[PDB]
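Field reference: "sequence" (input) and "structure" (output). Example, Glutaredoxin:
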Amino acid sequence: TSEAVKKWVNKIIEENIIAVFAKTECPYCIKAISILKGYNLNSHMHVENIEKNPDMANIQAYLKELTGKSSVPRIFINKDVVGGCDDLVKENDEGKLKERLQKLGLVN
């Protein structure tokens, strides 16, 4: 159950190069996802809405164990912690996001 939730989160992060944990009607989730889709990352992206899930609290606690925060969006790229939307904005603006994606063969 604790194990089940951890395995499920892990599976999301490990099966998808770009993994975003999000919730319903959240501007910073929407913004982050929109930025990532701007790199045409769709084919390698998975967005999980964790608010529509009976185990929301457990998922958030685990995301905090992994990354230091329980808030959404929580963004992983090839298993590495990017963080939230503000972290993504900083990486994108400073060229770090593009470099990440280049190394993954995702942007030419």
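DSSP finds five helices and four strands in the chain.
The first helix runs from residue 2 to 15.
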